[PDB]
Structure formats: structure tokens, C-alpha cells
Amino acid sequence: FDVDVALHLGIAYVKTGAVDRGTELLERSLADAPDNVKVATVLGLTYVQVQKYDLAVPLLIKVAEANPINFNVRFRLGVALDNLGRFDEAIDSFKIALGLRPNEGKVHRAIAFSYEQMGRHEEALPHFKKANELDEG
Numbered sequence: 263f264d265v266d267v268a269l270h271l272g273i274a275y276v277k278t279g280a281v282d283r284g285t286e287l288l289e290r291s292l293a294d295a296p297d298n299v300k301v302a303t304v305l306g307l308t309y310v311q312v313q314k315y316d317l318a319v320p321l322l323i324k325v326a327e328a329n330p331i332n333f334n335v336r337f338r339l340g341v342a343l344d345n346l347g348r349f350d351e352a353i354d355s356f357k358i359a360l361g362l363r364p365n366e367g368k369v370h371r372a373i374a375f376s377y378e379q380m381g382r383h384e385e386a387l388p389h390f391k392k393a394n395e396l397d398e399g
Contacts, residue, residue, distance in 0.1 A: 265291040265298050273305070276320050285320045292328040299328045307338055315342040326355075333362045337369060340376075349376045367396035 268291035275284030292299045306321035322339040329335065336359040343352035356373040360366065370393035377386040 263290075265296060269298055269302060273317060273321070276317055281320060285324065288320060288324045289327070292324055294328070299325065303329070303332070303335065307334065310338045310342045313345070315345045318342045319346065331362060333359055333366075336362065337366075337372075340369075340372060344372070344376050344379070347379075349380050352376045365396055367393045370396065 268287045272284040272287035272291065275281075275287065278284075288302070292302055302321050303325050306318050306325050309315070309318035309321065319339065319342050322335055322342065325335050326332070326339060336355050340352045340355040340359060343349070343355060353373055353376050356369055356376065359369050360373070363369070370389040374386040374389035374393060377383070377389070
């Protein structure tokens, strides 16, 4: 069973719409199986850079299962989910990113925006507060 072929066969089914079938393959290529996980991490993060949020998400979710405590992966998966309009998933992933680094203001900010996009202003406020008291001064 060829893993390089699974990741790329996986990603093409995601873009195609069959997000179930691809994510099976993607999962099947990152296991505690390889280092294909490094390749999936760069693709995932790059797809968020290049605003292909559609595709970044399954990767970064399966990356996150395989490397559960990569801060940048939970943070950018948050950013991508937020751009897809999946705000609860985004807050949930930003919460974990803050768990790994409680003093990244950029993460309080992002979570404040996700709440606001749901029209939940009182919940946004403390994060806006913490976001501001976590840089100068």
C-alpha cells in the first residue's frame, strides 16, 4: 500500500467533493506510519497561505490527529475553518492553540473575531481584552 500515492490521491478526492473517501486515504497515509506527516503539514499550512481553505482543512485535521500538539497547525486550522464559516470548529481549535501557548495574543484576537461572526459579542470581549494586555505594554 503506497502512502505517497494515498496522500495525493486523498487530496484530489477532497478537492473533487468526496471529502469522506479522501480523508480515509489521508488518514491511511499519515498514521504513526511515517513522515508523510511532514509533507502533509507543509501542504496544509501552504494551502492556508494560498487561501485554498477547502483543501487545507482535512489535511490539517489529519495532521493534528497525527501531531496533536503542533501550535501552528491548530492555529492555522482555526484560521481556515473561520474562513469556511465553521466558527464553532474554529473556536474549538483556537482554544487548543491557546492551551499550548496561553500568551499568543494573535490567538485571542482570532477567537474574538470568530465569536463576533456568530454575533456573540459578550463572549468576544475578554478575548479582545486578553489580546490587548498580551502586547505593549
